[PDB]
Amino acid sequence: MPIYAYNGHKPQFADRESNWIAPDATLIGKVVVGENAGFWFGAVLRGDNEPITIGADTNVQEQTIMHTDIGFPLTIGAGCTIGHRAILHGCTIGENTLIGMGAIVLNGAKVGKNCLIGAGTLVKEGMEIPDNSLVVGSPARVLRQLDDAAVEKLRASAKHYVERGHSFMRGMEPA
Template sequence: MHPTVFIAPGAVVLGDVTLGAQASVWYGAVLRGDVDAIVIGEKTNLQDGTIVHVDTGHPARIGARVGVGHRAILHGCTVEDDCLIGMGSVLLNGAHIGTGSVVAAGAVVPEDTRVPPGSLVVGVPARVTRRVDDALRARIRDTWEHYVAEAARHRAGAFPLARTSL
């Protein structure tokens, strides 16, 4: 594992999982590469409560500079570089999200759906509603840049876990 990777206490990473430089796996996230591979690109963040899982024949490949929002579920799917996956969204086996796309919070991307590069998808089931504009491209960049910086702070011990008594 690259020394710049941050895996938060309480996150679970097991099986065939590869994490790129400056990737971060946040509190309560689970990456379970038990029956196929999970590959996470550099500077990608898997925020609190995210689940990445696979099926046999359905690896999970998440590109570089991707922000994956809190409690998202990515199951046997592909997300290309420079994407934003909204909080609580679900990507099912065989879903393929093209470069520079945004999946809105709460969207469900059905099995084997191909989202073209630069698309905004919303809803249940997820549908392309428009092209990603400059403002959304900036938000994608701001998200991964923020999490790269925060991961470095957390890795350095800036936020020690509180000790509680019951």
């Protein structure tokens, strides 16, 4: 497994035996990993400037890129869903938020909790997004606030993905 140390710092796991990590996944340097977090195929977390902090119950899907610039730590609240091929750079993400596949969130951006950032959306540098927002577009705009039911599908997402992580540790075999 490509878990790498850089400049003396290595990924620290709150509970490593609970983390799903695909063979393709790469965690490097200052990465802080919560409980039940899963990192799927081709993901890259380069914790070489500011540290990258992954909350618990958080899924990081295929080929997500996370990185930082000095002055911009990257923090993800708990039970978040990071869609296939998202890019997160030097931003902070509230708990129970979904980042749609292929979406890009840039330095200094602040996404609230219980948010849905739609697929392909670009959240520009320093953009701030209120809790419970549904965000789509390029440029990104707040469409409306999410109902309490939508906010539940977010928690549901995090839970299914934790379980799915577990099942891959147990039930994925070469063929």
